[model samples]
Each structure stands twice: as C-alpha cells, then as structure tokens.
Target: YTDKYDKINLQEILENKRLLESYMDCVLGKGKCTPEGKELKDHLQEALETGCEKCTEAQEKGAETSIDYLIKNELEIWKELTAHFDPDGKWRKKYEDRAKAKGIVIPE
Candidate 1:
C-alpha cells in the first residue's frame, strides 16, 4: 500500500461536512469512494486489529484525530462504525486502553 494518501488534509475533511459524510458513506458502503477513501476502507480492518502497526506516523496521528472527533462529535456514527468493525469489542479494547493512556477520552 502506498503512503500516498497519508498526507491527506484530515483537518480540512473533518471541518467540511460534505467531505466527511462522503468518507463515512464510503466506509459504510452507502456510497462511492474516492481513491483515498478506498485505500482507507481497504486497510481499516487490518489497522484496527494490529493497532495501526502498518501506519505511517502521519497516518497514525490522523487516525487518532479523526477518531477523537467522531467519538466526541459524532457519537452515533462512531457507535455504528465501531459495531461494524469491532462487533466483539476485542480490537476496540486494546485501543481504548491505549487511548486512555494518551488521555483521549472515549465515552463508554
């Protein structure tokens, strides 16, 4: 996988409702994906399982930023995606612990 999409402007996407919705739609299989969104969708599961071991530094931080936003500002969407990706909570637990250490609050 190319790191080509790693530098995507996450803040820009996060601040833009339509752009963010399109990405959510892509991940949820509710709509078409741009190239970068497809890359994210393809690797999302592996990244979750391995704690993003394969991510570049930027990608890892980007993941944190986006997840923090979703958890705080889009709780319903976050719950839906969490249920989709981590139905059993195994993967989420690991990261939840790690995020706690980093002072990232994820409401239970």
Candidate 2:
C-alpha cells in the first residue's frame, strides 16, 4: 500500500470488503456466511470500518501517527483476510490487476 494516494473512506472500505468476499466466494465455492467463511468476513468488515474511520479522523486532525497506526492496522487485517481467503495469492493478483486496469492504485 502506498501513502501517496489518499486514505480509504467508508465507501472504499465497503467496496474492498465486497471485492475480498467475492474473491473468496469464487475460490471456495461458498458464500460469505458459509461455515468457515463467516468469521473472517465479519471480522474483516468490522476492521475495515474501524480502520477507515480512524484514518479519516487522523487525516482530519493532521495526525501522522494516528494515520500510520490506522493504516498499519488496516493492512494487517487485510493480510490476515487475504491469507485466509487466498492462500496462493492468485485471487489477490486478479484484484490487483483489475484495480490497475481501472487506474486504481492500491495505497500503501
């Protein structure tokens, strides 16, 4: 994730969450609420929301420390979620490619 880009807001968080869920669904042939998927999905959603809110707050306050902390926490949550859902990184690569094609840079 690059700090060059603006931080993610709530809508972006939701969109990324959806993207992650879709990738997992396709890979596992199951829905978000599936027995093995619900916990991760739910936790990721919660983390994304919290992280985005904190980051936004930090940005508004011009607090670099808070912003960095929130971004790091958010990335950690994403790492865990991605590892659980896309162990080989294939799905994540697809998402990255799609984002690049759409001119959407993944922030650091």
Candidate 3:
C-alpha cells in the first residue's frame, strides 16, 4: 500500500478538501452569518460545480477522483476523510496556508 499510494497529489487533495471546507463554512457561519454566509454559499456551489465538471472531464479523459470516489463508496474512507478534516487536525492549517499564499483575503 505504501509503495502504491505513498506519494499523494497534494494540490488536488487540498483542493477537494478546501471545497468541502468552503461548503461547511457556508453551512455553518464561521465568521459572520449574513453576507459572508451568502458569499460562502455561492463559493461552495461554485466549488462543487467545478468539482463535478472536473470529475466529468477526467472521466472523459480516462481519469478519476480516486480519493473522492473511495470516500463516496466506502464508509471507512469517508470516516478517514472526515477525521483529516476535523477542526483539530492539520487540514485547516493547510487551507489557511494556501489561502494566505494565494492572497485570498478572506473576510472577517
């Protein structure tokens, strides 16, 4: 397993995680609820749509979201994915780091 799946595609993995986080931020008011929530919701929708489109494109090109497909089809993988995305985990740090690096300028 280590030899076959040792090196993960970090950017793609992080993008999917970020999309989920953005969705959650929209669902649960991370900062402010009103306008920010609305904006986040829009972003979440866009991210999901983008992910779907990417999945479709990949399928057309003979690729797949192995991590995503696994999480969708396997309960254990879902659990592990959720664990990694837990607030106490390192996922948020990665999200913050990427956002800051990209100058995302998240509103307070």
Candidate 4:
C-alpha cells in the first residue's frame, strides 16, 4: 500500500542487468537489498494475494509491465522468481485465470 515506490522506473531497472540482478538477488534472499528492493520483497506476497488491490494505479501497471517483460524476455529469471514466489502455482493460475477472463494472454 506504499505509494511511495509507485513511481519507480521498472523498465529502466528491467533493462539494466545490474539493477535487475540486485532486485532478483534481494527477493531471492541471495544478497543485500536496496530500499526499493526491500519494499518490493515486502509487498510481493500481499500483492499476489489480493491481486494488487493495495497497489496504486502506477504500481499495478508496473507489475503488469514487469511480468510481461520478464516472462517474455527473462524466462530463466522469471522461472526462478516464479518458483520462489508461487511454488504451488496457486496464485499463478489464479492471476492467469483473471488475465484469461480479460482476454489477455500470459505466456507460460
């Protein structure tokens, strides 16, 4: 629910190897976390559970952009993150179903 981080330029981070790796590492518990990374890690679970109801408009869009880009362009990291965040595939299927209902295709 922290809109403070709603304006993060996720495209920039996703495009930058080092920044992306830092976030990935932090979320995966493999390295230290920047404040932004820590914020993301903290909210990831609730975001997944509530379908981002607590997210600001920008944050929701950012989530969509990040997921689309990662699944399409960073499948290995995406797989790792997905395994970490949704090991049971419960939330994954739930979100995918929501997208399906919206006629949006989320690649496997």
TM-score of each: 0.58, 0.30, 0.22, 0.54
Clashing pairs in 1: none
The per-residue C-alpha lDDT of model 3 at residue 5 equals 12
The superposed Cα distance between candidate 2 and the true structure at residue 27, in angstroms, equals: 18
The lDDT of model 3 is: 0.34
Q: Which stretches of candidate 4 lie over 4 Å from their true place?
A: 1-7, 16-19, 29-33, 40-54, 98-108
Worst 10 residues of 1 by lDDT: 1-10
lDDT of 4 by residue, 1-108 (tens): 222223243555555446565554444455445566556544542243324624876556556566555554665655555576576766767667544544455665
Candidate whose lDDT is highest = 1
Would you give me the overall lDDT of model 2? 0.38
| Candidate ordering by lDDT (highest first) | 1, 4, 2, 3
lDDT of each: 0.52, 0.38, 0.34, 0.51
After superposition, candidate 2 runs with Cα above 4 Å error: 1-73
RMSD of each: 5.2, 14.2, 17.1, 5.5
Candidate 2, residues 1-86: lDDT per residue as tens digits?
31111222222332344443443442244443243334333333333322222334433232233223324444554556456655
Per-residue lDDT of model 3, residues 1-108, tens digit only: 211112222123324544334333333434322454344333332222122223344332222233333333343533453453452554544434433444545333
